[PDB]
């Protein structure tokens, strides 16, 4: 058993020491290596050091080449031999990476063995233009009721998850990953979605817990975890979002649909700021380099909706930004807001009050909107958005009339309705029914503390002896007034049956 | 501007500019070998007596004393007019403190001009008899015609076995120590 | 799970001592005649690379 694996590893470890135009390390320090030699090297070309590390040839100076090292600088000494690979910096891509945890370079760190990749793609690829792009029209179902109703996400959209620390940004992202199991297990290949999670600057224990959570929910079968933890080098943390974006661009360019999450881009910008300050580049706003906007814009422009002549593929981005004291007026959050199509703001104040997810409805918008929703969800979310706007208008001053008390009670019931537990996303039909019950006044006699119990029992009742209702909803694709009257009657029957 | 073999090497810096100007001046005339050998003799005399180098590289002393000392030590070497003018130009711009660099830069020329490529061979133990001559035969076929091999041999027991060969353009690490090191690293990282 | 962990631990220990013994025996495997043969093979490979100009 073991001896066969040893023989396979020995036979596959062919050195092949031929030709090999090389250079010598003049000096090593601050994560940048100066190399004397390598006359015919290209810009942004991957090189290999003598210790097994890899690097990217950044600066093509006359007498030397400046190389950014993807690893620790204690493994490289003065006078080491640097070999060029002949290729601009690329990572393996494919369906072989599904179910795998890799680093920023694509090397697996989960111990599952080698990845049998057949193709590699470069990380510095330009974004598609106007012609190969079409309007975003397919829905991205995260399974969160507040996101799917109020701040909808479409496939190809860039939607920001921005908030302070410990507010549930990673929880929303992981629930979005887990929710795609119903689409992936189904037969419709057009609705299947492949997820990429890029962990940048996090602790290794946190990434291990995330991988275990994805493995328990069986969301790992369509997920690639790119890990660049807090103990890794800054160039690895900078490279990891682009490596994950290339892995998502594989599915984007092959007619498939990919959702990618960068948790979080603020730590990637901190790593890039460290790289630039060690390169003696001029600091700008908050000691950041002046191309950090270009860094995020060239990363996030690769997430787009392709046209039918390009395969009909898509790449959906969910960047994560960690703010300090809820300031969205800082440099990096304003950059990502200007880049992306919308944001999902998470409030610390709502998080301390137990409102989970703590989504600020007044600040979280989506510029796509009605094109990113189904017909029934859009029909009920327009009324929900209007009623929540009326509630926020009347609760700002009331800190009374019968109509004002009715609006306040309706807004309280909708707010308690939008609360959802962690790691349990819902199908779009269940969310449509839940928001329909909340909007249509079916919860007027129900206390706000019993809305969750009513929601669970109503879901059980619909799944038990009301399968024909779900079949009619799926067949029509909306809620007709006749089915609206039937739903009102069976809701009245259910609430009378529960208590009488 | 300057008529020469149009940079047989790629030598940079201000000292490289001085060395290329001296090479152009000594190749327009037929005094290249003479100026090479008197610069070698001057470098040997400076390395022989470090007090002369400390006298030249002293900012306290005036440049007239430095050029008088340079001319005095170039009279006994029976130098030519070109190297005297080169040293006067070096001490005129107060750049004679880097007089070791330009000569070394001038030693970097007449290697490509004579076709000599620098080769470095490092072994676990020094070898002879069956060695050396076969290494020269193997290295002779590595060059286009008109070029020669200048070989430097080193010994280091830390490489366990094998050979470390470096040429002026490429490197090969076909040694036993590095081979078993990467094989053990592969076995540890895989099994 | 106990049987799986016990077998995996024994396999890991077997792999570790096998690797260490292989390293020690490889360091003990060098003979001067084979060293001369390997040096001649390296010289032949260097000459073959010299042919491939």
């Amino acid at each position: 058993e073991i001896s066969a694996v040893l023989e396979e590893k020995i036979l596959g470890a062919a050195p092949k020491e031929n030709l090999e135009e090389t250079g010598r390390v003049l000096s090593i320090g601050d994560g940048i290596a100066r190399v004397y030699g390598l006359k015919n090297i290209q810009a942004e070309e991957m090189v290999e050091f003598s210790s097994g590390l890899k690097g990217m040839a950044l600066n093509l100076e006359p007498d030397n080449v400046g190389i950014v090292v993807f690893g620790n600088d204690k493994h490289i000494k003065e006078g080491d031999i640097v070999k060029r690979t002949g290729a601009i910096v690329d990572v393996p891509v494919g369906e072989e990476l599904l179910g795998r945890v890799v680093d920023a370079l694509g090397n697996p760190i989960d111990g599952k063995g080698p990845i049998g990749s057949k193709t590699r793609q470069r990380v510095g690829v330009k974004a598609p233009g106007i012609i190969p792009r079409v309007s975003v029209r397919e829905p991205m179902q995260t399974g969160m009721k507040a996101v799917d109703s109020l701040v909808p996400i479409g496939r190809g959209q860039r939607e920001l998850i921005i908030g302070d620390r410990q507010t549930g940004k990673t929880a929303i992202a992981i629930d979005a990953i887990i929710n795609q199991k119903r689409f992936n297990d189904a037969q419709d290949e057009k609705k299947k979605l492949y997820c990429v999670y890029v962990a940048i600057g996090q602790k290794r224990s946190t990434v291990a817990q995330i991988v275990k959570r994805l493995t328990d929910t069986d969301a790992m079968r369509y997920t690639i975890v790119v890990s660049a933890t807090a103990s890794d080098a800054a160039p690895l943390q900078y490279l990891a979002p682009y490596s994950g974006c290339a892995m998502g661009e594989f599915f984007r360019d092959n007619g498939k649909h990919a959702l990618i999450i960068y948790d979080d881009l603020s730590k990637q910008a901190v790593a890039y700021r460290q790289m630039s300050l060690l390169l003696r580049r001029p600091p700008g706003r908050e000691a950041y380099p002046g191309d950090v906007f270009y860094l995020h814009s060239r990363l996030l422009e690769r997430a787009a909706k392709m046209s039918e002549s390009n395969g009909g593929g898509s790449l959906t981005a969910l960047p994560v930004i960690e703010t300090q004291a809820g300031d969205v007026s800082a440099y990096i959050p304003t950059n990502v807001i200007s880049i992306t199509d919308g944001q999902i703001f998470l409030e610390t104040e709502l998080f301390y009050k137990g409102i989970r997810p703590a989504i600020n409805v007044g600040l979280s918008v989506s510029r796509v909107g009605s094109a990113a929703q189904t017909r029934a969800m859009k029909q009920v979310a327009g009324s929900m958005k209007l009623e929540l706007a009326q509630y926020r208008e009347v609760a700002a001053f009331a800190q009374l009339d019968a109509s004002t008390q009715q609006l306040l009670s309706r807004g309280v019931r909708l707010t308690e309705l939008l609360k959802q537990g962690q790691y349990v996303p819902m199908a779009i039909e269940d969310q449509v029914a839940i928001i329909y019950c909340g909007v249509r006044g079916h919860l007027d006699k129900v206390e706000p503390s019993k809305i969750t119990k009513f929601e669970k029992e109503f879901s059980q009742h619909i799944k038990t002896s009301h399968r024909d209702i779900l079949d009619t909803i799926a067949k029509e694709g909306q809620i007709s007034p006749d089915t609206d009257a039937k739903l009102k009657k069976v809701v009245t029957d259910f609430l009378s049956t529960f208590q009488a | 501007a300057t008529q020469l073999v149009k940079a047989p090497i790629q030598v940079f810096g201000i000292e490289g500019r001085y060395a290329t100007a001296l090479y152009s001046a000594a190749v327009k005339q037929k005094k290249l070998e003479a100026v090479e050998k008197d610069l070698v003799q001057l470098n040997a005399s400076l390395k022989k007596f470090p007090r002369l180098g400390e006298l030249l590289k002293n900012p306290t002393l005036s440049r007239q004393l430095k050029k008088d000392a340079i001319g005095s030590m170039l009279k006994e070497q029976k130098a030519v007019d070109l190297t005297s003018n080169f040293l006067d130009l070096l001490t005129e711009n107060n750049r004679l403190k880097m007089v070791d660099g330009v000569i070394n830069a001038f030693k970097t020329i007449m290697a490509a001009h004579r076709g000599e490529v620098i080769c470095e061979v490092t072994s676990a133990k020094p070898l002879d008899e069956a060695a050396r001559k076969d290494l020269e035969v193997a290295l002779k076929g590595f060059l286009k015609p008109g070029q020669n091999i200048k070989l430097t041999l080193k010994t280091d027991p830390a490489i366990i076995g094998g050979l470390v060969v470096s040429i002026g353009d490429r490197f090969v690490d076909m040694s036993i120590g590095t081979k078993i090191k990467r094989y053990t690293a592969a076995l540890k990282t895989a099994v | 799970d106990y049987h799986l962990e016990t077998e995996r631990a024994q396999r890991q220990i077997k792999q570790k001592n096998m690797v260490d013994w292989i390293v020690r025996n490889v360091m003990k495997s060098i003979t001067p005649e084979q060293e001369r043969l390997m040096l001649s093979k390296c010289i032949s490979d260097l000459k073959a690379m010299s042919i491939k100009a």
Partner: peptide
């Protein structure tokens, strides 16, 4: 085939260890 002497020596040592482990009954 141009089999490297180090790879062949490593394979011979692995086969030697496997034969000795069979002689030792699979013990360490």
């Amino acid at each position: 085939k141009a089999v490297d002497p180090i790879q062949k020596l490593f394979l011979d040592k692995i086969k030697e260890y496997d034969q000795k482990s069979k002689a030792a009954g699979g013990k360490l």
